[PDB]
């Protein structure tokens, strides 16, 4: 329904690396549209090792992102497709990943619950447009200058109406998606539960001390992570519902937003 707006290549100045991976490379940049103020942006491009199926995946990523217009989803500013290299220009998120922040900064209980509700709000919007993310984790949520949390990285997102390989993030994946390859709105919900666990701990990996095969066997047999010492009991209740074995009993993101919003203005 929506479409990426094309931007003149000469408006963009690429400045410095924000993050590199197998996916490609994200740069910090600036966009100087004539008669408008200069703004910081992020520019995502392809590995120097090109392949035309990778150009198409990047353009598909942009089209998915162009459908989103929400305060808790990283915004699409436009694309540069005439010429080479190709750039997808996105909103710049000054404060980096949610993961790095909670690991390295002091955060209050009211911040922890608001960030949780903000991510649920962004995922609710994604689902309400007919998509599933399939890759949610705290390293994939970014923080703006106002410390507003926003869902990023749509590399693996797919229309709901319809995996990677040895890179499967086992610690964030629901049992049914590991065993039967069934990805759905309710496996996104399971992953959000694990994200909440990350928000309330300061370790790098959930299930610390277990490898990936140990995690899978333990979780399919009914193990669940216990309540972090610094997590309020009403919050852990919500976290726990995201991990019910039967996916149909897990709440929707619309329900999660509401439950979290009630605690967000709770004094206790």
Residue numbers in the entry: 1532 to 1693, 1699 to 1804
Quote the study on this structure:
Receptor tyrosine kinases are crucial signaling molecules in animal cells, regulating inter-cellular responses to extracellar signals via numerous different pathways dependent on the organism involved. These receptors consist of an extracellular ligand-binding domain, a single transmembrane helix, and a cytoplasmic tyrosine kinase domain. The kinase described in this study is from the M. brevicollis receptor tyrosine kinase C (RTKC) family.
We determined the crystal structure at 1.95 Å resolution of the kinase domain of the M. brevicollis receptor tyrosine kinase C8 (RTKC8, a member of the choanoflagellate receptor tyrosine kinase C family) bound to the kinase inhibitor staurospaurine. The conserved Glu 1592 of the αC-helix is rotated towards the active site to form a salt bridge with Lys 1575 of the β3-strand, oriented as “αC-helix-in”. The kinase is crystallized in “DFGin” conformation where the DFG-Asp is pointed towards the active site and the DFG-Phe interacts with the αC-helix. The tyrosine residues which would be expected to be phosphorylated in the activation loop (Tyr 1697 and Tyr 1698) were in the disordered activation loop region. There are three hydrogen bonds, with Glu 1622, Met 1624 and Arg 1670 and five hydrophobic interactions, with Leu 1549, Val 1557 and Ala 1573 from N-lobe, and Gly 1627 and Leu 1673 from C-lobe. The ligand interacts with hydrophobic residues (Gly 1701, Gly 1702, Val 1704, Val 1706) in the activation loop and Trp 1752, Asn 1748 and Gln 1749 in the αG-helix. The purified RTKC8 kinase is catalytically active and can phosphorylate tyrosine residue containing peptides generated from its C-terminal tail sequence.
